[PDB]
């Protein structure tokens, strides 16, 4: 046959179109879209049975175990995370390279990326991965440092195709001053990088954690209390102001705050290049799940939580992340943002720590270390939820099917196409473009069918995740659809509940400069950078 | 050959994608997208030479001459307007059917559409056309009003595939009360219609016109003065409030006011189904052109108050409703197009001659001494020709000059969204194998040093291929133009030439828009009886 | 406070005077430090009737962190003090000063350029957020920024106890007076300015203040 794979009887969904057509795939790429393709022309033929075909998901916010141990030990390797991603219809992940402050000179940041690429090149990879760079140590003064930082970004991009930098406004050892952010922004704008910010006021978080501990309020639930939405709102506002002054395109990661969404929206209306990411957990969960007591998950249907296991006072740790899962009434605003253009993309902020083993360096119970003066206080809980697998099906069900998202086109826009565009992986990734797209595709089950599919899961279970963690926060909940086929670079890597390891051929992905991240060339004053 | 047409060496632009690929067309439809298509498989092969291929434009706000003469005599027939559309890369137009208040009973509105369809079936049509229904006479009380209107809308949709209704909040004889709007909204929501509003406060317009005339301030320039942006802002706010109360999806036509854009934006952020249209003239022109960066260098426009200052009436060329706004407003129109405020862009094409003074279709119709008309702005027929220039104007001043973010945004607002919001999708608006009518525009290549004699440098009246004697954009530079306009698989426009033998346009029955199903959200516990 | 009262008790005073206290050194961590900062305010009030505290978000040596502001606010609220803030983002001011100097743009006029209204807007917003979290009445001194005025207004509409002060110079002067070249003073009527004395390149210093006199 002339094509490796033909997909017949399906409905193609892109970020702007929904229509019945068929797809031919060859040499790892989309080759052809036509009304009907002769099945004799393909080596493998898949009957979609009227189901949607989407591009594979692109999750640009995944945390994997890495040599520098920035977030301590994480349970998932790149192998584990890509396997999990593919079982849930995500076909590209972007994880994070930790700045190695032991390296100096022009190559220091390229060398930071080298550690990750080298480590993962030895693992079995189920899909492609790219890397963001995390920066927490910025040379001062501003000007003296300009030459080298600029040169260091150039090297990171030239050597490894890293074109995004992530920075924090909170966390001890990660938080950087406004001064340093400006210095970084000077370099990223000059280099056409995607600038990412975790925008919570660290000072406010720090102060309020101390205040709560002083009162003995140290249970998992007070993680949220320590940092209300106003904190995220403030930092986001401050970060927009920096980006404006610096004329730097900026993306806010894992946005969860109505007040943050509001200032983001206002910036977008002004035409400032301000992009934002949110996560399923911020639309689907409220903070009531962190202790024992309709636009989201029925919390009582979740298995192994404070509701089901009230005696286990530590079980709330399963749902502890940053920014925190918010109080009831917040979640609707997150769906609104997804629909109205506030949120450019959706990622998982996938970050896994075991709950049912208590002894390892990658356990949630890491918070108990009597010898290091740690007694399970929320401050010591490793922050994160497993979510790379459940991201796509969660938005398919609770978003599209249940009507919280306006269409399937909106779903594909925020889960597939915009992630590729904003992180320089477009057009290779994110769409269904003949001759151009990597054949990264998801075939779902048909929605209106009375046909039984024994392979189709009814509930979310840990086993379904295909990951290296012993829990998923979404254990026990109903799921109305799942990937039936996940196709990565023209090969079936996931079929009807089974991972096909022999088809695992994921690779490190050198990215380009994003067209969304060229500067607006609009300034607050007459001042311009020297190079302008 | 198995395909009528192959397009090679081009870059496909859709509302979400830009990429190099080739297109095969057969039996009036897009049949195939692939990296490379064997030229021997096609009867005709077009080398795009690296240029963009877009879907044909869809202009959902075009005014054509019609039997009831709502806007008096208009110079363009459906024949003239479709010819002009195609010369400028637009391949579907949606005009307006005037409610015939002489027709009664359940079929009254279907019969209103019949007049237009019958009239135009006798003309040469260069591309497809649909029709909106204009409503200005609504029965009272509400309970009766909303109920016959129900059955009348059903008949209009069932007989003619009309699924949109246009209403006015201004103009004597067109303006309807909020009470009547609610009655119509009750009917349109029940029927999944697209509800359209011209939102200016008619009372304020009327009062201010009389106030100006009393001071002898009657020159064309005072048309703008009689109705500042705050007037459009108010009515738009009021119309959103109605639509909210009534849980009815609503579209605002030809939006020009920052205040109106503001309240629209706020509704959209809330998740309310509020859509909006703007027009090139509102981003490109300021009201300085009516008398004597972001858009057009107004001094480069030929035959205006600047070039002909003696001709006190020449500002009428640029008189429309809502008016061309003062300087400084235009930037916010581009921002709205980029930020999601404006769902679509139309032309509000409405042509009256300037260089002949005597016909019923002339701008000088405003001079009629034995009828107490002496060229006062009130008497100037409102409208600009714009169906032709709409696409190239956004291509140039939008995409090339950087006022729009990308070509994808351009296609979204000019092509795909108009089809979606007006029930023409997926047949129209995109490039979908096996599904799309083959309505496509091949532009000239942008970074080429090659000469194209057929490529226009300036906008001229002749280039418009219309029945009007002027275009408001006469004399201005245009950096790109359609090189090929393909309508249902046939080349109707090629390198400056209209190919009339390939004109095969038809009336277009439309469906219910997926964008206009109601939100099912209410202000109170009250629900429609049927709900 | 004693140092000032003692010094001034020796001078001829034409009218009455009170004193605000300026705080720039705050003990850390907050909880440990609580009892003393509380007790120190009590003493200042009891001994001298000082019931207001001033703090800065800009100026090297005066600028204090959000963390320290919270610590102070904890003490001031408990003691019913009037809490005052100079709200400009010091980090942005510092960074932009260095950037301008690097380009040799060091004339008096660039004082304003170094710290546009958005800088004052940001810090004010941040300070309101602190005051809200801390339930502390707060007053912003010498407000000059539209953006600052906007977030102040919004806070007031919500009913939050946010007060503000402005100054004649911010209503009456524009930054055109700091260099060569209708609701206020006709700037050409001012004597001995860059307009009248263009040769004196330093004369703009007469009108240099913080926050700066703003653009037209
Ligand atoms: O962004 C982050 C770091 C990893 N985990 C988390 O919850 N937030
Ligand atoms: O809606 C309308 C009618 C035709 N033209 C115009 O300017 N407004
Ligand atoms: O608040 C201050 C300190 C001294 N003067 C001034 O201009 N700003
Ligand atoms: Zn984070
Ligand atoms: Zn993260
Ligand atoms: Zn109108
Ligand atoms: Zn109109
Ligand atoms: Zn001060």
UniProtKB/Swiss-Prot annotation, chain B:
Residues holding Zn(2+) 2: 166, 198, 254
Parts forming coiled coils: none
Protein name: Dihydropyrimidinase
Broad enzyme group: hydrolase
Protein species of origin: Lachancea kluyveri (strain ATCC 58438 / CBS 3082 / BCRC 21498 / NBRC 1685 / JCM 7257 / NCYC 543 / NRRL Y-12651) (Yeast)
PTM field: Carboxylation allows a single lysine to coordinate two zinc ions.
UniProt family annotation: Belongs to the metallo-dependent hydrolases superfamily. Hydantoinase/dihydropyrimidinase family.
Co-factor binding details: Binds 2 Zn(2+) ions per subunit.
Assembly behavior: Homotetramer.
Catalyzed reaction equations: 5,6-dihydrouracil + H2O = 3-(carbamoylamino)propanoate + H(+)
Function as written in the Swiss-Prot or TrEMBL entry: Catalyzes the second step of the reductive pyrimidine degradation, the reversible hydrolytic ring opening of dihydropyrimidines. Can catalyze the ring opening of 5,6-dihydrouracil to N-carbamyl-alanine and of 5,6-dihydrothymine to N-carbamyl-amino isobutyrate.
Gene symbol of the encoding locus: PYD2
Residue positions, PTM N6-carboxylysine: 166
The keyword Zinc is assigned to this record: yes
EC assignment: 3.5.2.2
MF terms in GO: dihydropyrimidinase activity; metal ion binding
Induction field: Up-regulated by dihydrouracil and N-carbamyl-beta-alanine. Detectable only in cells grown on dihydrouracil and N-carbamyl-beta-alanine as sole nitrogen source.
Binding site for Zn(2+) 1: 61, 63, 166, 348
Lineage: Eukaryota, Fungi, Dikarya, Ascomycota, Saccharomycotina
Required co-factors: Zn(2+)
InterPro entries: Amidohydro-rel, Hydantoinase/dihydroPyrase, Metal-dep_hydrolase_composite, Metal_Hydrolase, Metallo-dep_Hydrolases_sf
Keywords: Hydrolase, Metal-binding, Zinc
GO cellular component: cytoplasm
Residues annotated for substrate binding in this entry: 171, 321, 382
